[PDB]
Amino acid sequence: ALYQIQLLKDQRILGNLLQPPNERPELPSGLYVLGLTGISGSGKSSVAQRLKNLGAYIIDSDHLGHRAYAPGGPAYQPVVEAFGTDILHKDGTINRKVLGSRVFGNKKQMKILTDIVWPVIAKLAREEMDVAVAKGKTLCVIDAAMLLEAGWQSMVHEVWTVVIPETEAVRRIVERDGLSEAAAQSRLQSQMSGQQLVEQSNVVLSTLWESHVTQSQVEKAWNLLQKRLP
Ligand SMILES: CC(=O)SCCNC(=O)CCNC(=O)[C@H](O)C(C)(C)COP(=O)(O)OP(=O)(O)OC[C@H]1O[C@@H](n2cnc3c(N)ncnc32)[C@H](O)[C@@H]1OP(=O)(O)O
Known part of the structure; x- marks a missing residue:
């Protein structure tokens, strides 16, 4: 049987367990938690969707953030206090274009x-996991761009990072988001490097190759995960 495997060098096999998982006494007993992160342009939302298709319960931190500071949400009053009512749309919702x-x-x-919002999102993520476990879910993925910068590895058994070369990342950002190349590198500089993410990861993936190769990596990663679940 002939096949290909994917590697990262300076060797790490993509999909394999690279270092031991974390012990997490404070998480609910039935539940295993992955933290999914990556550099902007990494395509990690594609990976999150593939894990969702395999049966993982996904917690999207970007969405939780938007809800955290929705009117009625725990971060609304503090964010409006900290930035002023000029950030508000006519209907009183936060204008994220202005905030951004x-x-x-x-x-x-x-x-x-983020001093306001990250703790609020982390609390909302913990609550969602509790609800998921009550409803019989056993594997949760917290999808977060700034997972490690927020210290949220404290909430997960394994950190899974999605990586791509910085040149391709910048290209995806400039093209897909209509950013200037300086705005794109500004984005990338404002977060950890791929190498930093890799060093603190239990599992590494990449969207560098065509879609079927990503699927294969994710399936391989998923299968190895299943065999090491408690
Ligand atoms: C720990 C976490 O990862 S929590 C989830 C991320 N959220 C935060 O960090 C809270 C602060 N950010 C925000 O409130 C919003 O991103 C805003 C208001 C600044 C901008 O809102 P929007 O214009 O709707 O942008 P949106 O939330 O879709 O984010 C756009 C991109 O910026 C990224 N981003 C969000 N927050 C941050 C941050 N603190 N630092 C760097 N990049 C960020 C997003 O992950 C997203 O990347 P993608 O396009 O590769 O998915």
Whole structure:
């Protein structure tokens, strides 16, 4: 039988367990948790969807964030206090285009925001996992761009990172988001490098190759995971 495997060098086999999982006494007893992260342009949402198709319960942190500071949500009042009512649409919802203009590319302002929002999202993620476990789910994935920067590896058994070369990342960002190349590198500089992410990962994946190769990696990763679940 002839086949190909995917590797990262400076060897790490993509899909394999690279270092031991974390012990997590505080998580619900029936539940295994993956933290899924990657650099912008990594295509990690494609990977999250493939894990969803295999049966994982996905918690999308970006969405939880938007709900956290929806009117009625725990972060609404603090975010509006911290940034002012000029960030609000006419209907009183946060205008994320205006908020983004305040914080993107701006280290101090983004920190005012994430100091408020990240703890709120982490709490909402913990709540969602509890509900999922009550409804019989046994494997949860917290999909988060800034997982390691937020310290959220404390909430997961395994960190899974989706990586691609920085040149392809910048290309995907510039093209798909209509960013200037400087805005794209600004985005990338404002987060951990692929190598930093890899070093702190239990499993590494890549969307560098065509879609069928990504699927194969994810299936291989999923199968190995299943055999090491408690
Ligand atoms: C720990 C976590 O990962 S929590 C989930 C991420 N959320 C946060 O960090 C909270 C702060 N960010 C926000 O509130 C919003 O991103 C806003 C208001 C700044 C912008 O909102 P929107 O314009 O709707 O952008 P959206 O939320 O879709 O994010 C756009 C991109 O910026 C990224 N991004 C979001 N927050 C951050 C951050 N703190 N630092 C760097 N990049 C970020 C997103 O992951 C997304 O990347 P993608 O296009 O590769 O998926």
